[PDB]
Amino acid sequence: GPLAQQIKNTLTFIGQANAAGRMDEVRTLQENLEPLWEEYFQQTEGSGGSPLAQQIEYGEVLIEQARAAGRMDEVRRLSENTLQLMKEYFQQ
């Protein structure tokens, strides 16, 4: 419950930062969202998790691999897609 609420709040803050033209904050919010989702995924979904949860989880892995390679344009594209899936998962 509390962890889901923190993820939902983070999605709201990303929306607000985006609407304010504050993409420097969207970068930070996306980075802090990843470990919250990771914890949520490993505790409530995991290997037996729903296909949507697995798609979001692997999407975050692809984002992190793109970030490690410096492909921040790919981070942004993948982040936009994975955020839409998270909004479906959390009904946000």
Author numbering: 2 to 93
Give the authors' words:
For scaffold library generation, we chose a semirational approach, targeting the original zinc-coordinating residues H35, H39, H61 and H65 for replacements by Asp/Glu. Three out of four hits originated from the MID1sc9 template (termed MID1sc9_4xE, MID1sc9_EEED, and MID1sc9_EDED), while one hybrid variant hit (termed MID1sc9_H1_EEED) showed shuffling with the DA0 sequence in 4 positions, namely T11I, T13S, N19K, and E32L.
Notably, the tag removal improved the K D value for MID1sc9_4xE by 3-fold (K D = 32 nM). However, thermal denaturation experiments showed a drastic drop in melting temperature for the metal-free proteins, from 66.3 °C for the MID1sc9 parent scaffold to 37.5 and 32.9 °C for MID1sc9_4xE and MID1sc9_EDED, respectively. Lanthanide binding restabilized both proteins to melting temperatures of 43.9 and 45.3 °C, respectively, in the presence of Tb3+. The asymmetric unit contains a scaffold dimer with polar interactions in the crystallographic dimer interface. However, the dimeric state was not present in solution, as determined by analytical size-exclusion chromatography with static light scattering detection (SEC-SLS) in the presence and absence of TbCl3. Notably, the parent MID1sc9 sequence contributes two more glutamates (E32 and E58) in close proximity to the putative lanthanide binding site, generating a long negatively charged cleft with overall six potentially coordinating carboxylates. Even though the protein was cocrystallized with TbCl3, we could not unambiguously assign electron density for a clearly positioned lanthanide ion. The absence of Tb3+ in the protein structure may also be a consequence of the crystallization conditions, which contained both malonate and citrate. A Tb3+-bound structure predicted by AlphaFold3 also positioned the Tb3+ ion in between the residues E39, E58 and E65, further suggesting that these residues mediate lanthanide binding.
